[PDB]
Design an enzyme around this catalytic site. Sequence first.
Site, PDB file in Angstrom:
ATOM      1  N   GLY D  29      -9.567   2.657   0.830  1.00  0.00           N
ATOM      2  CA  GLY D  29      -9.841   4.096   0.835  1.00  0.00           C
ATOM      3  C   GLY D  29      -9.623   4.780   2.173  1.00  0.00           C
ATOM      4  O   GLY D  29      -9.347   4.129   3.180  1.00  0.00           O
ATOM      5  N   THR D  30      -9.766   6.106   2.176  1.00  0.00           N
ATOM      6  CA  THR D  30      -9.556   6.912   3.382  1.00  0.00           C
ATOM      7  C   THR D  30     -10.726   6.734   4.349  1.00  0.00           C
ATOM      8  O   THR D  30     -11.792   6.259   3.963  1.00  0.00           O
ATOM      9  CB  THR D  30      -9.391   8.416   3.060  1.00  0.00           C
ATOM     10  N   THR D  31     -10.525   7.123   5.605  1.00  0.00           N
ATOM     11  CA  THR D  31     -11.539   6.919   6.637  1.00  0.00           C
ATOM     12  C   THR D  31     -12.636   7.983   6.576  1.00  0.00           C
ATOM     13  O   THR D  31     -12.353   9.176   6.470  1.00  0.00           O
ATOM     14  CB  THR D  31     -10.927   6.927   8.052  1.00  0.00           C
ATOM     15  N   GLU D  46     -11.509  11.878   6.289  1.00  0.00           N
ATOM     16  CA  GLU D  46     -10.069  12.104   6.205  1.00  0.00           C
ATOM     17  C   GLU D  46      -9.677  12.392   4.756  1.00  0.00           C
ATOM     18  O   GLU D  46      -9.930  11.575   3.868  1.00  0.00           O
ATOM     19  CB  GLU D  46      -9.330  10.858   6.713  1.00  0.00           C
ATOM     20  N   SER D  74     -16.143   6.107   1.218  1.00  0.00           N
ATOM     21  CA  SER D  74     -14.750   5.674   1.153  1.00  0.00           C
ATOM     22  C   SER D  74     -14.587   4.636   0.055  1.00  0.00           C
ATOM     23  O   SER D  74     -15.461   3.789  -0.127  1.00  0.00           O
ATOM     24  CB  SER D  74     -14.325   5.064   2.485  1.00  0.00           C
TER      25      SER D  74
END
Lengths: 231, 250, 195, 243, 212, 240, 235, 244
Positions: D29-31, D46, D74
């Site tokens: 996943g995204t940060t 993010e 995330s």
Amino acid sequence: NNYDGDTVTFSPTGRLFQVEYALEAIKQGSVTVGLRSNTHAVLVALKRNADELSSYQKKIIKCDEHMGLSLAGLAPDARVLSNYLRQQCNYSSLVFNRKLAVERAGHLLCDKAQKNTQSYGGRPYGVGLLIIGYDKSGAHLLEFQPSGNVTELYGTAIGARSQGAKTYLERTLDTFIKIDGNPDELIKAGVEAISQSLRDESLTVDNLSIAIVGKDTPFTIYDGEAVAKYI
Amino acid sequence: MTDRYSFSLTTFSPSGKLGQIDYALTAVKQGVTSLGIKATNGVVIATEKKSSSPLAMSETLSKVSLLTPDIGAVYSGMGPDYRVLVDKSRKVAHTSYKRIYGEYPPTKLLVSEVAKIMQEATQSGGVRPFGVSLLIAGHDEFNGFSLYQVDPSGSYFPWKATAIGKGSVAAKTFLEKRWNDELELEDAIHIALLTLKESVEGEFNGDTIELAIIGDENPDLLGYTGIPTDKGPRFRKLTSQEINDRLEAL
Amino acid sequence: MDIILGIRVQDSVILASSKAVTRGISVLKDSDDKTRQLSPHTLMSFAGEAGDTVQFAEYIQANIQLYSIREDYELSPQAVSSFVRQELAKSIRSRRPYQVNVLIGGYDKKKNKPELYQIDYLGTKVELPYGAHGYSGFYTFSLLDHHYRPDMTTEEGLDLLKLCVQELEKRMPMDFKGVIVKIVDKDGIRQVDDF
Amino acid sequence: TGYDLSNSVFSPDGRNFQVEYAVKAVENGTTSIGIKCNDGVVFAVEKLITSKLLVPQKNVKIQVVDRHIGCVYSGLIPDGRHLVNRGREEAASFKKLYKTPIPIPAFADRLGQYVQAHTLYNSVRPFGVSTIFGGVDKNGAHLYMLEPSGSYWGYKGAATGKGRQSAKAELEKLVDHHPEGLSAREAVKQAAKIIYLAHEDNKEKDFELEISWCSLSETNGLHKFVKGDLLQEAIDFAQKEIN
Amino acid sequence: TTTLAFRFQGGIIVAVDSRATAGNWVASQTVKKVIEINPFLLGTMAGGTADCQFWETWLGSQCRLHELREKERISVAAASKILSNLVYQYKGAGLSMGTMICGYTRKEGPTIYYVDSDGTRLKGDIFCVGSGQTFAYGVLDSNYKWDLSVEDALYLGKRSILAAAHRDAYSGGSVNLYHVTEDGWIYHGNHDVGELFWKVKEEEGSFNNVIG
Amino acid sequence: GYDRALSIFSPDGHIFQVEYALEAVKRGTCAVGVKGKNCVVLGCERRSTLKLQDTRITPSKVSKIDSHVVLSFSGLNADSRILIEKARVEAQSHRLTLEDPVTVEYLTRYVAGVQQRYTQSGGVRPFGVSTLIAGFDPRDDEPKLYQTEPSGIYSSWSAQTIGRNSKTVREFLEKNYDRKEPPATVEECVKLTVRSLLEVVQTGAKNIEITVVKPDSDIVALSSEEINQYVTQIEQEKQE
Amino acid sequence: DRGVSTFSPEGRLFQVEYSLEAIKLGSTAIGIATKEGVVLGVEKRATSPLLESDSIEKIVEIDRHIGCAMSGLTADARSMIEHARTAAVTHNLYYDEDINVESLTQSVCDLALRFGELMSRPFGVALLIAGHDADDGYQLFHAEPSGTFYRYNAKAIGSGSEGAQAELLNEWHSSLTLKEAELLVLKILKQVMEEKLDENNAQLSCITKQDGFKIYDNEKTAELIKELKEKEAAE
Amino acid sequence: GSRRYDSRTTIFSPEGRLYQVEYALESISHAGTAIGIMASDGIVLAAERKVTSTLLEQDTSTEKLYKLNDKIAVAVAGLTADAEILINTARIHAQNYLKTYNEDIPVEILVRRLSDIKQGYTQHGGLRPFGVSFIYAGYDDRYGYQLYTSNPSGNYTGWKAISVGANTSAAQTLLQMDYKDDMKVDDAIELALKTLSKTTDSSALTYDRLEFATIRKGANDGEVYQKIFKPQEIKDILVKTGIT
Ligand SMILES: *[C@@](C)(CO)[C@](*)(O)[C@H](Cc1ccccc1)NC(=O)[C@H](Cc1ccc(OC)cc1)NC(=O)[C@H](C)NC(=O)CN1CCOCC1
């Protein structure tokens, strides 16, 4: 492989294969397009038949006077989810005398789809939805995926060869977003968008399905001779 | 969520064996040796207190348990399984007998109720059998003294004398030579200590041996006086000192 | 509803039951048969609350008929009466009890004896030489105490029964429109058409 | 083997492989990050701009629980939403019975027990999210990070997602350089910088920055989104540092 | 209400009034108290209007489901027993119904069943139901013969409702007539008591209690 | 509750549990139904590996569902009791509400529905039983013979057989039964039924049961000697 | 084994796809819609000559204005018909009107996916639902165990379906009379059937606004069979 | 989920057999043999205890023969614990019938219900069947003396003489050889013991490895008496027939 027997099982790389297989059913579905300006939101759907003797499977469903969606994938699953939306829109009206925000509609669909991906016995929904609506913050377009992921967009497309329309809308973004106070032009842009996903077949009178909602327009669907204007 | 295991975990194999019951009996075989001997005027049940650590206080772990004032139990196999069975056995003696008849159940019937509980763990959904064999010694007015063995299957058999667990095969043979139908309780306690020494390896004293009797009524252990018909518990756990006294004249 | 009588004689049980169905100030029917055949040699008459009576009678009838088909065998009058009593004994502590009083007349083929059972809505069962439910008993019991003999014939039983109906027609306040009489014996159940 | 095919099954190591497989979904996943400050906390995430067609500012990922707690996660986004929905139910019932708004450590265990419960049975799947959350209560500021196993701790700074190691390294520098404490307005600017630095591990698609914060002095102890002038100021601070 | 139905040589006559009341307030004078279940079945309504109207329409749906499932028109006995078993389930709850299920089938012939809300179910040749039942009985009983002609039977049924409409304060409006034969039911018109009374009085010479 | 879907579709479109239930029926003792001009006869095989039986008390192969309808079967005996019980209860329930005994078609339709329900309910297996249901509708003299099977399908037959070696006796009936002229009497119908069983049975001793149903609740079971006379007569005509 | 409600890697439900194979094994059913009515015809297919063919009931009435033909595991259809009839009658009770043919079909199709781990498996039968209503006139629907229904001008289901459907593609036009449709069903049934078509092994039915749903007598169908043979020989 | 561990106890084999029932019967074939013999003036129940130990308390023991009511008894072959579950149900069922009809339960009715319970465990619920076969011996005023047997399938049948458990094939051949219809109880007692003595897997049949019972009308006038034999009584009857 060994981790696709049910939704309750993660793969060693952290994937849910049943959810991915449900996602695959959408890719086989007939193309449908969504796009909006600041005043109106438009759905355009390519309908599919069994053969020349059959009817064309209806793709667009009305949820309320101000909201509705188009479907791609398992149609019965769209019926279940649309019915759930109809109830949630209706609850908001009866209890709060309040038109359900299109954003909340998305949140509700996300949470309903999610529960089917974490429990034994159940299965993910096998359909993708494009929800359009006009509420207190103007026109909206949502994209529902049965993974649970809902996404608000200016325009999009799902189904087989949806990448053609999705690329076109990505180019046309600056044009169609400012088609304000002009329904027929916003539809024309959507009809031109879905045309980028056609192969060997063209848009006929009992093939094309268009829906529109906006500032002074209830969610209404156009089929048959009413879409002849746009071919 | 919820228990989705609504199906049997113990099933018949093609040869006719109930695998889990057989494997439970195997767990009992691994267990420490316990035994029971029936005398004319009492019953004795005995076992070795296998200490898990010398820092552990083995007095806090009771292998021989009172079920009713006249009934006592000992086991071989898995301790935790035994502990919950004793809890259930004590409760069922009340709910399905004392609260109905105003008196404690006879040994055979309490044994029957414990057997039922162990049988259900053999057939019910989503459970394994209990991994223990029990020896239940008791007394009641119309049957006198009795001694029963309860297996993981739920089967029970009355015994004059028997042993279960680690060195049961040798212990049973020892008891066959020594047992007669004229044994007095003190003679049975003597034979019990002799039989147990064969299976025990390390220390053999009142702190490493647990031993209880079903004998005469104990008015001093009743806790009250005034009711003539109430005369006190026949179950009595022999103290660490009482065992050592008998180990000198061994 | 209202009048149901029963007389056990030497070789048969005779049940008499009133023909009137009254509701308010109108006699709606004067030919009502307040009885059900439970089995070939067992008859049950009934009286009590409207609706409850027939609903209960037919429910018992269905059960006894079900038993007969299952076992290919006829339950004894004693067994049927015990079944009926228990159903009423359950009913009395229900949310809405059956308010039905019954007489069960049967011929036990194994014993070769007639049997009459009186059971009220509480589930109170008694075997009797003669029985009645409701206000009828207040006249008939004393009458039968006098005229009844245990060794009477079916014909003598019918004459004894005529005496009861005559007394009731003379002293009862309501018009019960006569009775339907039925005889239970070794040959089963039959109806007397001219009474 | 086959020990990894069913949830709640112990491997011979003493591990629940299904939970470890859920952790892989989180790493994909995204940060997202959390920074504890003087009198509050700051959250930042993010948002990968997949396409031009995404409406800016209109796919909000940070969620509020009650009026004083902020949550960000995330991994599988729907799984995170399910966990927040539970968090809201838990917080509501706590306020209902006890009147006071749920303390952050109390709230942390409510989520912790619920996520742990999803490692006890084979009929449920573990959560595919690591959740960073926190807020301000009667005892001051608290920042937490919860993982698929149910494991959570209190943090000075937290990070999860594809750029977690880059973010962690940046967080550790702040903790070392500011032993007395970081101010709320500073933490917002730092959060922006760290997301921009952590974006290097996801640099194909460009992204949209989202920040929120609870602070006893700045937001009056309530959770608020950072928008407009304060957001653009934080974005500019971050843009200046990458160059 | 006053409703009746009687059996005779030529089939079944069914006659009802058309008044609805709420206490002493005359709520309606044009109510339909006969419900046509199928071409061979009729139901009469007396008691609570909603109770009767709702459950007899429901009865019609059950009878339709029977002939779909069994490929055969429901018997009068079975149709009446559906209604009686239904109201028996509600016994004590306070339903108020006095109904008559009239019809013809091959196996039964012309048949009439009385069904009420305390669970009474009776087969019979003549019944009168409603607050004015006694007034109808008085005329009907004293003129009834099995050998009445279709013309005379229709009139007697009409005349019996008129009798009750006149005397019973809670009956009136108009008379609805039906004749049930082997071929089904036949409607024989709505007859306003406003005109019918004076017409009957003049032609028949009856109703001498009234100022002519 | 135990929920498992035991009866499910396979890749080729078969429900194997239903089809394996048919194998249980194929293992069962042979049963045959033949309807004449004014009667139906139910014949049943009884295997002779069981001597020392008590035939007074042993469950009979033909069961009365009501006084006018009978049910015979092939397959698992224990399973058949459950179907017979349910049928008998429905028979009394029908009399109670409709005030008329069941038609043979209705009773069959019910029994077939029960069997079908056990093919798409969770936690249950299908009945390992096929039935022959015979009788006469109330106030009717037209003979009725129906057959049901584990899947839940049912149909009417002029004559039919089920159980082991049923394909042999069906072959016999197919050439020996004339639709234009069914067995005109009771004797003819019983004989054709006994003949058909003798193709498969072994000895005509205590191996054959015959039950005759006639109109208006007239059902009787033949004794050994009565059946043995048919066996004796058929064999003497055969030696030709 | 595996879950009953499991998706294949191609995005289809295994059980639904397997039930479709069961329907291909079923006997042929054909429906044709005209402006004068809708005709429904089926192959009876008796497994043995001793079986009384008139007891084979594969065409069924739902209401006076709606009829139904089936193909596949026909025992599975009983509860679908029961539901359909209850749905039709219930709507008439609640609204004092005939229920739309499409609404009926939708109600039946709602049962379809109510399986899993509700019933234990999908239905193994496909239905052809034919009817008339005031709004959309004469209609023919094909209801599948997937929960999907299509409206058709003409449709064949069962073992001879793909051959019969290709034939219907050529023969159907928007000006067919009822009599023309009757003969067309008989013609196409005779082509795809194994045994030789007659009045005993094939059954016709129709729904018209005036007379409602009617299953034809064996005498009536026999004359249409004779009329059909004569017309094919006449050129 | 849990599907992985489900044995599916209630399914058919491709041959149309119930796996678990067949395997339960295989289990029962290793249990001690039990024999029932019905005479014109009574019934005999005889059963062999499973390999006995000398320290087993023989007199206060019950393993094979159980009393259901005053008129009906059963001989058990299989898991004892399973049998006691079913016996208590059968005992309760008899009392329900007596409470309802004020008449002792007919033998077949009791047998049918117990057999129906067994049947249920083979068709639904996903549980293992009861690993038990019964011989029912009883009397009622309809059929008089009756012998039945039921097994894990839930199928029951009536008998003149029958054996369950171990060596039934050999036992049944011996019973079929020497049984005749006009037989008396005392003759049946001898046949039962003789059959066990020949089919036994032990070296010699002794009193301590047997349970014995008779159901006679040998009370006083038109009433039935159940006699569960004491150890000493079995010792005497074994000497009286010259087996020891
Ligand atoms: C005559 C006129 C005497 O009432 C008839 O019985 C007539 C029958 C009838 C049947 C169908 C259609 C029209 C007329 N009954 C009535 O008109 C009826 C009288 C009645 C009132 C109350 C009752 O409850 C005890 C029973 C019968 N009138 C009504 O039902 C009126 C129109 N409505 C109400 O009184 C409303 N009530 C009904 C009961 O619940 C409370 C509200």
